[PDB]
Amino acid sequence: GDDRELAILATAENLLEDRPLADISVDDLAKGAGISRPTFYFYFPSKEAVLLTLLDRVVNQADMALQTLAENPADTDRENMWRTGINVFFETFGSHKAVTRAGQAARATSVEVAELWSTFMQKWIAYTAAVIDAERDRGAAPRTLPAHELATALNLMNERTLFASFAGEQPSVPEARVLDTLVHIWVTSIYGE
């Protein structure tokens, strides 16, 4: 039952490494999960809905790791604090590149996918802003831009830059340089007066 479901998801994540959702059929997903097409439809309304669930899992996995970090602060300087935080996104989305890629593309055509991304981006920006405000209240960061506006731009940077790297777009930062690239820009923009 729930195994049929995980099989469908695993099959879909697999096929998305080789081709776009447009080039994967419900028959393709049924076949791969070892069920019939009507049986597939019992579990999921559409292949689109399969993507949404995979994206939902990746996004929630990043979110939960971030919550875990927030509750268990690493004992380091402020540079490594931010690095650790950004790394949650680097590793989580980096471990799920096909889903990341197909999820980002589906924003154009799926109101549910766009709202899912938007909901979590808003949550992550609000967390980023709270940390910057904490740092300013401590007197560690100067009061420059509105914290929420700064957080917005830094989070949008991370989205576009990480996803460009992961897809090997031209242009992009090499994947092996992207973490340090983002941490430098976070730290200088957050602490620079």
Ligand X SMILES: CC1CCN(C(=O)Nc2ccc(C(F)(F)F)cc2)CC1
**Helix, strand, or coil (residue 28):** helix
10 binds a second copy (CB under 8 A): no
The end-to-end CA distance of the chain, in Å, is 57
In the complex with ligand X, the residue whose CB is nearer, 11 or 100, is: 100
127 binds ligand X (CB under 6 A): yes
131 binds ligand X (CB under 6 A): yes
Q: Which does 192 bind (CB under 5 to 8 A by kind): a second copy, ligand X, none?
A: a second copy
Q: How far apart, in whole angstroms, are the C-alpha atoms of residue 32 and residue 11?
A: 6
Question: CB 119 → a second copy: shortest distance, Å?
Answer: 9
Structure token digits, residue 80: 């490594």
Question: CB 66 → ligand X: shortest distance, Å?
Answer: 6
Calculate the CA 7 to chain-centre distance: 22
Which residues between 67 and 86 bind ligand X (CB under 6 A)? Answer: 82, 85-86
* Residue 42 C-beta-side C-alpha neighbours within 13 Å: 10
CA dist list (Å): 83 to 60, 77, 80, 86, 179:
20, 10, 5, 5, 7
171 binds a second copy (CB under 8 A): yes
189 binds a second copy (CB under 8 A): yes
Cβ neighbours of residue 187 closer than 8 Å, sequence gap 6 or more:
78, 79, 82
In the complex with a second copy, the residue whose CB is nearer, 4 or 107, is: 107
Which stretches of the chain bind ligand X, using CB under 6 A?
66, 82, 85-86, 89, 93, 121, 124, 127-128, 131, 155, 158-159, 162
